Structure 1
Amino acid sequence: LMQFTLPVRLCKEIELFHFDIGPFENMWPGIFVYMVHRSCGTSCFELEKLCRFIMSVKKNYRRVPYHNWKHAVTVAHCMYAILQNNHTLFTDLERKGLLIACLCHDLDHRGFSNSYLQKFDHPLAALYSTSTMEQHHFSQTVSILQLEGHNIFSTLSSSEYEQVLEIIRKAIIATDLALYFGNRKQLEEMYQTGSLNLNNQSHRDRVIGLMMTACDLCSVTKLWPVTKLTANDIYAEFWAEGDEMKKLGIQPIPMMDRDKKDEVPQGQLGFYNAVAIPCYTTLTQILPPTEPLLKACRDNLSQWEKVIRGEE
């Protein structure tokens, strides 16, 4: 009979897409659990295992500016918001899997891109030739599942356990933004030729793909002061990578060069047009109730336009 309840402001704001989880680390575990209980059920996961699993995941995120424990809970909230606004479209198994897939999706991120692992010649690039970090994140997810007392899916049948771990795997892989562009193009066509069908599992995998890129990017769907201060977190990682690239004797792309701070507004603009806006556009078309994400993304587009004209 043991539910989590949140202060009134949070209980009410958490159901909105633009919810920010705030600066009190110690609340994020309760917030996550609250989300699982409302989205999935009180029964979905034995609470002793869920808590112990949540705390091992936290322990395995590093202290990097952006790809941190706070990013993990943020992405899981965006997924919660999608699943609560589309509650008949998804299986019991997808609801379980995706919230766990989102929390785990950047486990053990070092704050370096797949490109920097390859050019450094890091061991993980030898183990995994594409989607290097993403396959590492899935690997660490299995690791923490197999720690004693941590199997939150112990109740699942052999088949169900295999189906969910597959959902999680494809979910995490999809957060590889290099795979997104093609995934959205195919989902664009299928919808517009009327061929998109959610009883086709290969089609459901694509939709979940896009969902995962939507949640992963949801910093651009927040209030402007949250979007603005998150863009500082992202650029600090990128400028640290460019420094490292320089140390290998390679000019980094301008995105990653700190001597090119000033072209950031123009950079975030490019990003909204080429990635975020298409992502949230195609997602709205497929799942109409996700519109707020597109509305909020457009508002922040317009706020970067305004920075460029030195109106702020």
Structure 2
Amino acid sequence: ETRELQSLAAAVVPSAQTLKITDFSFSDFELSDLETALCTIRMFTDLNLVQNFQMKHEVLCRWILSVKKNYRKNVAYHNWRHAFNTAQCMFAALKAGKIQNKLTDLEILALLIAALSHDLDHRGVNNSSIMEHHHFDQCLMILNSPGNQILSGLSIEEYKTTLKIIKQAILATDLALYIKRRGEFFELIRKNQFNLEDPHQKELFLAMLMTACDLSAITKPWPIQQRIAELVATEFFDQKNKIPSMQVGFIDAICLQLYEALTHVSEDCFPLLDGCRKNRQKWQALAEQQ
């Protein structure tokens, strides 16, 4: 046991309300590493995954700290804080967005693990679905490491189902796969034909939800979103004239239709769409002052 595991395992976990993890506007800038770990325990707990799958407290704690350690702190955007935020967006969409009741327990378990694990060992966009296969391999390696086996409570049939959902969810975070598959999702939604009871559409919806969470910095209150956009710029460049129009371009091409679609699946996800619209206005106004 390290010092960090001792302290995390012994801490009280504040409630979801106290931690503000149910809010689509959540920000981690003021949180220490230990506080993000406690937030992550609270997500597992309030989705009832600790109960329903009999996770030992110290095992969940070691797993969370192994995940965190296998992100690189030296990478400006694709690091533990991005993974932590993606998972918090998943938690908020499940709870405040009322997605929880559309999904099975095994799907929710797989979505939360995938959210936290989907960029593992990223070295920055400039450093040379190959990447997402590697993120999944890292995720599996951690799930199988001694003392980290948070899925040990599942039966082998549950285990196999969950692992395959995790893998598809992490593979879905490849934006090239999102662009190839979203047309079918938009098509089903515009024809009022979308139906989650169909396995094929369910898997499609889980893929889209992963992308919505992965991108969700774009939905945050403008001061937060501006700061996150700075991290992205740092990673893309360090490893400003045209940035506003590039942001508008990314919002239109990638984000707006996804959050509109998800609001059609669940009206309680509207704050994501609303936040993305408000950011597009701010960036456009700046783009017009070139």
Look up the match of 2:71: 61
Is 1:89 the counterpart of 2:68? The answer is no
Distance 1:7 1:178, change over 3 A: closer
Look up the match of 2:279: 300
Look up the match of 2:13: 4
Amino acid at match of 1:71: H
Is the contact made by 1:3 and 1:37 (CA closer than 8 Å) also made in structure 2? no
Segments of 5+ residues of structure 2 without an aligned counterpart are 1-10
Segments of 5+ residues of structure 1 without an aligned counterpart are 118-130, 242-260
Is 1:72 the counterpart of 2:79? The answer is no
Amino acid at match of 2:204: R
Is 1:28 the counterpart of 2:40? The answer is no
Q: Aligned partners of 1:40, 1:21: CA distance in 2, in Å?
A: 23
- Superposition deviation, residue 271 in structure 1: 0.6
Aligned alpha-carbon RMSD (Å): 1.8
Per-residue deviation, residues 11-55 of structure 1 (Å, max 9, x unmatched): 4x3211111123322200000111111122441422111101111
Is the contact made by 2:49 and 2:109 (CA closer than 8 Å) also made in structure 1? no
Q: Aligned partners of 2:12, 2:206: CA distance in 1, in Å?
A: 28
- Superposition deviation, residue 99 in structure 1: 0.8
Is the contact made by 2:16 and 2:22 (CA closer than 8 Å) also made in structure 1? no
SS in 1 for 2:227: helix
Q: Aligned partners of 1:57, 1:14: CA distance in 2, in Å?
A: 19
Q: Aligned partners of 1:106, 1:205: CA distance in 2, in Å?
A: 20
- Superposition deviation, residue 3 in structure 1: 6.8
Is the contact made by 2:196 and 2:202 (CA closer than 8 Å) also made in structure 1? yes
Q: Aligned partners of 2:49, 2:175: CA distance in 1, in Å?
A: 31
Say how many residue pairs are matched: 274
User: Which structure 2 residues correspond to residues 92-103 of structure 1 after superposition, within 5 A?
Assistant: 92-103=105-116
SS in 1 for 2:241: helix
TM-score (norm 2): 0.89
Per-residue deviation, residues 60-104 of structure 1 (Å, max 9, x unmatched): 100210001100110000000111122211101111111111000
Is 1:111 the counterpart of 2:124? The answer is yes
- Superposition deviation, residue 282 in structure 1: 1.2
- Superposition deviation, residue 110 in structure 1: 0.3
User: Which structure 2 residues correspond to residues 259-278 of structure 1 after superposition, within 5 A?
Assistant: 261-278=240-257
Per-residue deviation, residues 128-170 of structure 1 (Å, max 9, x unmatched): xxx1110000000111111111111111111100001111100
Per-residue deviation, residues 162-208 of structure 1 (Å, max 9, x unmatched): 00111110000000011112222101112223332212222111101
Q: Aligned partners of 2:196, 2:246: CA distance in 1, in Å?
A: 36
Is 1:289 the counterpart of 2:268? The answer is yes
Is 1:169 the counterpart of 2:179? The answer is no
Is 1:39 the counterpart of 2:52? The answer is no
Q: Aligned partners of 1:93, 1:174: CA distance in 2, in Å?
A: 18
Is the contact made by 1:75 and 1:215 (CA closer than 8 Å) also made in structure 2? yes
Larger mean Cα displacement after TM superposition, 37-46 or 161-170 = 37-46
Q: Aligned partners of 2:192, 2:125: CA distance in 1, in Å?
A: 40
- Superposition deviation, residue 307 in structure 1: 1.5
Look up the match of 2:178: 180
Larger mean Cα displacement after TM superposition, 55-64 or 194-203 = 194-203
Q: Aligned partners of 2:48, 2:165: CA distance in 1, in Å?
A: 16
Amino acid at match of 2:23: L
Look up the match of 1:196: 194
Q: Aligned partners of 2:208, 2:16: CA distance in 1, in Å?
A: 32
Is the contact made by 2:242 and 2:287 (CA closer than 8 Å) also made in structure 1? no
TM-score (norm 1): 0.83
Which segments of structure 1 move beyond 3 Å, counting only runs of 4 or more? none
Percent identical among aligned pairs is 38
Is the contact made by 1:62 and 1:68 (CA closer than 8 Å) also made in structure 2? yes
Amino acid at match of 1:75: T
Look up the match of 1:219: 217
